[PDB]
């Protein structure tokens, strides 16, 4: 497929800095070259430079609101530009707050998009429900139209217009959901497959239902926001908020292989890879390796094999 | 839910001593505080003091019969007392021989109970089939009415009256069953899902069928006897008889989440946690952490999230 | 069941030497004694002595063609002899190129055989599609009747006559398939369950369909060629070409338990165990332990338990 890569070396959605090295380590892993080794037409739109906002005091509990809000504003622009050039946006994060900008800019071009959110967390705290104040745990609240009425005017975010409905998103992988987040889930009727449903149904039925849920009525472009902590920390240890009992490497690949097969992948976030948090060099390479793998699957790399349209015999 | 905690620091059902520290390490992990953090009304009935029986020579092959038999006699009493106060008995072991006392005292109050036994082993050796002589591998033989005729009068156990039928118990997790135990399984028509059935059906169908099997005819209180070695040693390494190829952490939580949802959990054993056997400090915390997790799930903690009956928005 | 063990200490199908120690380490693990502990009638046909072919230069890209071709010629003979004595051939490898000889000699006695190939790889490169030149990645091309027309006369292999059709083989476990191999798969209509299908269906349905596929029309003897790298390297690390995201230890046992239950297991290869490649002593024992386990399952050892035809009570 045809891809537009955008690096988002940004960390101010949470406390730990190392996540701004995500684009660097993924690139160094050979992400671009590997995509080209596939059937892929790849344009690198470069790493976004996120200007310092040195004056950025908390809004109530919410931390670094202006830095976070600007970075997403910049990113939305960049994504919209790549979507206009007919390319699948590939955002290398960076913390998950960047999801506000990536989905936003994506929906500017394709308002009918549907979102699949792979994550141990729902990231749906409002600035009023959050207890941490970390904006990487709130991006979904800023995007949901139904929640427009419970989001205060947070400095840095006046540019935002909620662009998805509670029924345009499916979560997969949930296993550490805050109480206010759970309340929002059940109240807005959000579709989710927590680890419990994955256990119950198997990842096969999960993907069946998820795609049926989003694509049933009609075909529409897909946005996959992949938080690497959605996968078990035995595969992606170098990440800020690891939770045990995650999706397996195999489930990870299955999800993305199935998404690729729809032919409707339109936007992709690979988020929260933080090399600094690897207890060892191998934990770092293990995490980065898994991240590349998930990404390659999104763009056609299949476990059964791939071949070019020729006669190999 | 409403819980009555009882510590059973007892080890004489098997050779290794460290298992009598189970209640201590689980308590230190924050078990009680965490239960209270949930919707839980918790009363701690304390650690049972198991008086020394210094004169306790083998009965044939059977080791420490009087100590084991007394500890279970004491425990049955304690459980019956907590069942009378309208509380879910939570026995922190301690080796699995304590199951004789816990189920016994439970059935005194609720004779119509059904048992779910999560374990790598069937624990159904008689004093005549056992080759080890370790009573933690025999508790089920002492409780089955059908086996009353093949249990010799073992000193310490004259107080016991078999209280469950072959058709009131379901095993989940089996993967190291002795030949005599397998003979008993197939002869008495015992319902089991070994690791093979879990592999074949998926833990979803397993729980479906297990609950359907026990609750089909009518609702009745549930006794969950959970041997931590039911789970793979990659999750619960600090245990006396680990067997590879176990239930995953996720399957472990799925079982207990589903049991919680029945609303019929009546008695619970968390057994065979032995800190002394952790090859490292982290193996010890890993085991204890998993044990708490399984327990919290039994009393309502859900992977999809929990919220109080209020409007979080 | 009734077994004829044959050691094949052979490595010239690939670069690393340690794999010729496979028979030694498996024997030292207690394989024969453990089989006898089961219901098993076991005859050891010894370790085949594979004479040096010091003059064995590449055929085009293909390495050690004469050594590989001779070893398989010798092995086919040995297998046919054990099949004539009414025994299940058990070939301890050794690299997977030996599969050419084992299936060949097997089919001499039982031409209607069906093959189950458990592996991360398809091993179906021709001498013209291979890029590595390693013959352990080509054995299936030498055996398929449909490919007879695309196999050059490679020195050492004039004795070979393709003995299976594209529709007599099922792959399970695939996750690193070369492009030419994938082309062959889809062109010849080969039945496979890659890790993707295992993820989608569950190992239960996979085995259901695999056996239905091979045994549907009529009963026929089964050849299981098991490459230990079919399993995840977290279980079988000491092997030449490990690929992450493999079959679990549990799936491994499930496959073989189900195959045993058909009562049609006729030939078995346990291949690619290489002690030299264990990063630690425990990685070596871990691999060998898993290999024995898979083998024991093939010959009746069940996770639910086994008992002799007697009254244990
Ligand atoms: C406690 C937490 N829910 C954690 C959010 C984690 C964010 B991530 O990794 O992007 O999913 C919060 O801060 O609101
Ligand atoms: C060999 C064995 N079957 C082991 C029993 C293990 C007891 B446990 O951990 O409570 O399940 C025996 O001693 O009878
Ligand atoms: C790249 C590879 N496909 C690897 C083959 C591996 C062989 B094994 O372990 O027996 O499956 C090739 O050499 O043709
Ligand atoms: Mn997360
Ligand atoms: Mn996230
Ligand atoms: Mn046990
Ligand atoms: Mn037990
Ligand atoms: Mn292989
Ligand atoms: Mn192979």
Tab-separated table of N, CA and C in Angstrom, chain A residues 133-216:
chain	number	residue	atom	x	y	z
A	133	UNK	N	-3.770	13.612	35.598
A	133	UNK	CA	-3.510	14.849	34.883
A	133	UNK	C	-2.721	14.649	33.599
A	134	UNK	N	-2.325	13.410	33.323
A	134	UNK	CA	-1.546	13.098	32.122
A	134	UNK	C	-2.439	13.017	30.901
A	135	UNK	N	-2.195	13.878	29.915
A	135	UNK	CA	-3.084	13.982	28.757
A	135	UNK	C	-3.080	12.765	27.821
A	136	UNK	N	-2.081	11.893	27.939
A	136	UNK	CA	-2.073	10.679	27.123
A	136	UNK	C	-3.155	9.694	27.578
A	137	UNK	N	-3.796	9.982	28.709
A	137	UNK	CA	-4.881	9.153	29.213
A	137	UNK	C	-6.239	9.803	28.989
A	138	UNK	N	-6.266	10.851	28.166
A	138	UNK	CA	-7.508	11.563	27.878
A	138	UNK	C	-7.864	11.762	26.399
A	139	UNK	N	-7.008	11.313	25.446
A	139	UNK	CA	-7.257	11.780	24.070
A	139	UNK	C	-8.662	11.494	23.560
A	140	UNK	N	-9.242	10.361	23.935
A	140	UNK	CA	-10.536	9.993	23.383
A	140	UNK	C	-11.657	10.919	23.861
A	141	UNK	N	-11.512	11.489	25.053
A	141	UNK	CA	-12.547	12.400	25.560
A	141	UNK	C	-12.650	13.658	24.705
A	142	UNK	N	-11.511	14.100	24.162
A	142	UNK	CA	-11.445	15.292	23.306
A	142	UNK	C	-12.047	15.083	21.919
A	143	UNK	N	-12.191	13.823	21.511
A	143	UNK	CA	-12.631	13.501	20.155
A	143	UNK	C	-14.103	13.091	20.061
A	144	UNK	N	-14.681	12.649	21.175
A	144	UNK	CA	-16.053	12.145	21.163
A	144	UNK	C	-17.059	13.278	21.174
A	145	UNK	N	-17.964	13.272	20.202
A	145	UNK	CA	-18.992	14.303	20.111
A	145	UNK	C	-19.914	14.282	21.318
A	146	UNK	N	-20.177	13.087	21.835
A	146	UNK	CA	-21.097	12.907	22.962
A	146	UNK	C	-20.574	13.541	24.246
A	147	UNK	N	-19.261	13.723	24.312
A	147	UNK	CA	-18.620	14.246	25.510
A	147	UNK	C	-18.416	15.753	25.414
A	148	UNK	N	-18.828	16.323	24.289
A	148	UNK	CA	-18.741	17.761	24.096
A	148	UNK	C	-19.821	18.425	24.938
A	149	UNK	N	-19.409	18.884	26.118
A	149	UNK	CA	-20.295	19.375	27.153
A	149	UNK	C	-19.650	19.069	28.491
A	150	UNK	N	-18.693	18.146	28.481
A	150	UNK	CA	-17.962	17.790	29.697
A	150	UNK	C	-16.457	18.024	29.558
A	151	UNK	N	-16.046	18.664	28.471
A	151	UNK	CA	-14.644	19.024	28.293
A	151	UNK	C	-14.475	20.530	28.496
A	152	UNK	N	-13.794	20.931	29.590
A	152	UNK	CA	-13.548	22.360	29.820
A	152	UNK	C	-12.665	22.951	28.724
A	153	UNK	N	-12.660	24.273	28.610
A	153	UNK	CA	-11.756	24.924	27.676
A	153	UNK	C	-10.351	24.872	28.250
A	154	UNK	N	-9.614	23.850	27.843
A	154	UNK	CA	-8.236	23.676	28.263
A	154	UNK	C	-7.322	24.440	27.318
A	155	UNK	N	-6.476	25.325	27.865
A	155	UNK	CA	-5.549	26.070	27.013
A	155	UNK	C	-4.775	25.142	26.086
A	156	UNK	N	-4.749	25.480	24.805
A	156	UNK	CA	-4.042	24.701	23.810
A	156	UNK	C	-4.974	23.890	22.927
A	157	UNK	N	-6.238	23.790	23.324
A	157	UNK	CA	-7.170	22.894	22.653
A	157	UNK	C	-8.413	23.575	22.094
A	158	UNK	N	-8.368	24.889	21.894
A	158	UNK	CA	-9.538	25.558	21.333
A	158	UNK	C	-9.734	25.202	19.861
A	159	UNK	N	-8.695	24.660	19.236
A	159	UNK	CA	-8.742	24.294	17.820
A	159	UNK	C	-9.512	22.998	17.589
A	160	UNK	N	-9.739	22.239	18.661
A	160	UNK	CA	-10.296	20.897	18.548
A	160	UNK	C	-11.787	20.933	18.317
A	161	UNK	N	-12.238	20.107	17.385
A	161	UNK	CA	-13.657	19.850	17.222
A	161	UNK	C	-13.852	18.341	17.244
A	162	UNK	N	-14.616	17.844	18.226
A	162	UNK	CA	-14.878	16.405	18.324
A	162	UNK	C	-15.345	15.869	16.977
A	163	UNK	N	-14.769	14.761	16.521
A	163	UNK	CA	-15.011	14.302	15.161
A	163	UNK	C	-15.532	12.870	15.045
A	164	UNK	N	-15.631	12.162	16.169
A	164	UNK	CA	-16.168	10.797	16.151
A	164	UNK	C	-17.283	10.599	17.164
A	165	UNK	N	-18.201	9.700	16.830
A	165	UNK	CA	-19.301	9.362	17.708
A	165	UNK	C	-18.943	8.112	18.487
A	166	UNK	N	-19.605	7.930	19.623
A	166	UNK	CA	-19.369	6.771	20.468
A	166	UNK	C	-19.460	5.490	19.644
A	167	UNK	N	-20.230	5.523	18.558
A	167	UNK	CA	-20.421	4.326	17.742
A	167	UNK	C	-19.488	4.209	16.532
A	168	UNK	N	-18.418	4.997	16.508
A	168	UNK	CA	-17.435	4.901	15.434
A	168	UNK	C	-16.109	4.379	15.966
A	169	UNK	N	-16.103	3.887	17.194
A	169	UNK	CA	-14.861	3.397	17.792
A	169	UNK	C	-15.036	2.024	18.449
A	170	UNK	N	-14.022	1.180	18.303
A	170	UNK	CA	-13.972	-0.098	18.998
A	170	UNK	C	-12.629	-0.223	19.717
A	171	UNK	N	-12.680	-0.480	21.023
A	171	UNK	CA	-11.481	-0.795	21.792
A	171	UNK	C	-11.183	-2.293	21.755
A	172	UNK	N	-9.906	-2.632	21.630
A	172	UNK	CA	-9.461	-4.012	21.835
A	172	UNK	C	-8.272	-4.041	22.793
A	173	UNK	N	-8.349	-4.863	23.850
A	173	UNK	CA	-7.216	-5.129	24.735
A	173	UNK	C	-7.323	-4.620	26.170
A	174	UNK	N	-8.456	-4.012	26.494
A	174	UNK	CA	-8.606	-3.284	27.744
A	174	UNK	C	-8.361	-4.167	28.964
A	175	UNK	N	-7.596	-3.648	29.926
A	175	UNK	CA	-7.371	-4.353	31.193
A	175	UNK	C	-6.993	-3.472	32.390
A	176	UNK	N	-6.947	-2.152	32.200
A	176	UNK	CA	-6.771	-1.228	33.326
A	176	UNK	C	-7.564	0.056	33.084
A	177	UNK	N	-8.863	-0.012	33.352
A	177	UNK	CA	-9.784	1.072	33.058
A	177	UNK	C	-10.159	1.785	34.358
A	178	UNK	N	-10.028	3.107	34.374
A	178	UNK	CA	-10.403	3.891	35.547
A	178	UNK	C	-11.925	3.879	35.721
A	179	UNK	N	-12.400	4.081	36.955
A	179	UNK	CA	-13.844	4.062	37.232
A	179	UNK	C	-14.676	5.060	36.407
A	180	UNK	N	-14.218	6.305	36.303
A	180	UNK	CA	-14.896	7.292	35.483
A	180	UNK	C	-14.900	6.885	34.021
A	181	UNK	N	-13.801	6.285	33.574
A	181	UNK	CA	-13.722	5.768	32.209
A	181	UNK	C	-14.735	4.643	31.993
A	182	UNK	N	-14.852	3.738	32.959
A	182	UNK	CA	-15.818	2.657	32.832
A	182	UNK	C	-17.241	3.210	32.791
A	183	UNK	N	-17.513	4.203	33.628
A	183	UNK	CA	-18.814	4.870	33.605
A	183	UNK	C	-19.115	5.427	32.211
A	184	UNK	N	-18.152	6.136	31.625
A	184	UNK	CA	-18.307	6.663	30.266
A	184	UNK	C	-18.556	5.551	29.244
A	185	UNK	N	-17.816	4.444	29.359
A	185	UNK	CA	-17.992	3.316	28.449
A	185	UNK	C	-19.432	2.856	28.420
A	186	UNK	N	-19.960	2.541	29.600
A	186	UNK	CA	-21.285	1.945	29.714
A	186	UNK	C	-22.381	2.961	29.456
A	187	UNK	N	-22.112	4.224	29.754
A	187	UNK	CA	-23.117	5.267	29.543
A	187	UNK	C	-23.290	5.656	28.068
A	188	UNK	N	-22.179	5.801	27.355
A	188	UNK	CA	-22.235	6.170	25.947
A	188	UNK	C	-22.397	4.965	25.030
A	189	UNK	N	-22.427	3.768	25.599
A	189	UNK	CA	-22.645	2.572	24.807
A	189	UNK	C	-21.488	2.257	23.874
A	190	UNK	N	-20.274	2.454	24.370
A	190	UNK	CA	-19.084	2.233	23.564
A	190	UNK	C	-18.782	0.745	23.364
A	191	UNK	N	-18.398	0.388	22.146
A	191	UNK	CA	-18.089	-0.992	21.816
A	191	UNK	C	-16.661	-1.294	22.218
A	192	UNK	N	-16.486	-2.333	23.029
A	192	UNK	CA	-15.165	-2.726	23.496
A	192	UNK	C	-15.010	-4.246	23.600
A	193	UNK	N	-13.789	-4.704	23.395
A	193	UNK	CA	-13.438	-6.069	23.715
A	193	UNK	C	-12.267	-5.969	24.667
A	194	UNK	N	-12.555	-6.077	25.958
A	194	UNK	CA	-11.515	-6.105	26.976
A	194	UNK	C	-10.818	-7.458	26.906
A	195	UNK	N	-9.763	-7.644	27.690
A	195	UNK	CA	-9.084	-8.941	27.696
A	195	UNK	C	-10.068	-10.063	28.044
A	196	UNK	N	-11.094	-9.733	28.818
A	196	UNK	CA	-12.111	-10.725	29.160
A	196	UNK	C	-12.846	-11.245	27.918
A	197	UNK	N	-13.243	-10.341	27.028
A	197	UNK	CA	-13.937	-10.737	25.802
A	197	UNK	C	-13.013	-11.493	24.858
A	198	UNK	N	-11.739	-11.094	24.842
A	198	UNK	CA	-10.737	-11.762	24.011
A	198	UNK	C	-10.594	-13.173	24.521
A	199	UNK	N	-10.481	-13.316	25.834
A	199	UNK	CA	-10.448	-14.644	26.447
A	199	UNK	C	-11.695	-15.468	26.087
A	200	UNK	N	-12.860	-14.841	26.183
A	200	UNK	CA	-14.128	-15.527	25.968
A	200	UNK	C	-14.308	-15.948	24.519
A	201	UNK	N	-14.049	-15.024	23.599
A	201	UNK	CA	-14.413	-15.225	22.200
A	201	UNK	C	-13.289	-15.766	21.319
A	202	UNK	N	-12.043	-15.449	21.669
A	202	UNK	CA	-10.908	-15.701	20.798
A	202	UNK	C	-10.709	-14.491	19.908
A	203	UNK	N	-9.465	-14.179	19.572
A	203	UNK	CA	-9.174	-12.995	18.759
A	203	UNK	C	-9.807	-13.056	17.362
A	204	UNK	N	-10.094	-14.264	16.887
A	204	UNK	CA	-10.763	-14.427	15.606
A	204	UNK	C	-12.152	-13.793	15.572
A	205	UNK	N	-13.003	-14.198	16.515
A	205	UNK	CA	-14.353	-13.652	16.620
A	205	UNK	C	-14.316	-12.162	16.962
A	206	UNK	N	-13.414	-11.780	17.866
A	206	UNK	CA	-13.206	-10.364	18.192
A	206	UNK	C	-13.026	-9.497	16.933
A	207	UNK	N	-12.109	-9.890	16.054
A	207	UNK	CA	-11.873	-9.129	14.836
A	207	UNK	C	-13.080	-9.205	13.903
A	208	UNK	N	-13.680	-10.387	13.829
A	208	UNK	CA	-14.889	-10.545	13.052
A	208	UNK	C	-15.908	-9.500	13.478
A	209	UNK	N	-16.229	-9.488	14.766
A	209	UNK	CA	-17.232	-8.572	15.286
A	209	UNK	C	-16.817	-7.108	15.199
A	210	UNK	N	-15.543	-6.827	15.443
A	210	UNK	CA	-15.063	-5.451	15.405
A	210	UNK	C	-15.227	-4.836	14.017
A	211	UNK	N	-14.874	-5.603	12.995
A	211	UNK	CA	-14.945	-5.108	11.630
A	211	UNK	C	-16.411	-5.067	11.203
A	212	UNK	N	-17.172	-6.065	11.634
A	212	UNK	CA	-18.593	-6.119	11.321
A	212	UNK	C	-19.263	-4.897	11.935
A	213	UNK	N	-18.853	-4.558	13.155
A	213	UNK	CA	-19.403	-3.410	13.871
A	213	UNK	C	-19.113	-2.089	13.157
A	214	UNK	N	-17.885	-1.926	12.682
A	214	UNK	CA	-17.482	-0.682	12.022
A	214	UNK	C	-17.845	-0.609	10.533
A	215	UNK	N	-17.849	-1.758	9.863
A	215	UNK	CA	-17.989	-1.797	8.407
A	215	UNK	C	-19.333	-2.356	7.949
A	216	UNK	N	-20.141	-2.790	8.905
A	216	UNK	CA	-21.418	-3.401	8.606
A	216	UNK	C	-22.299	-2.531	7.730
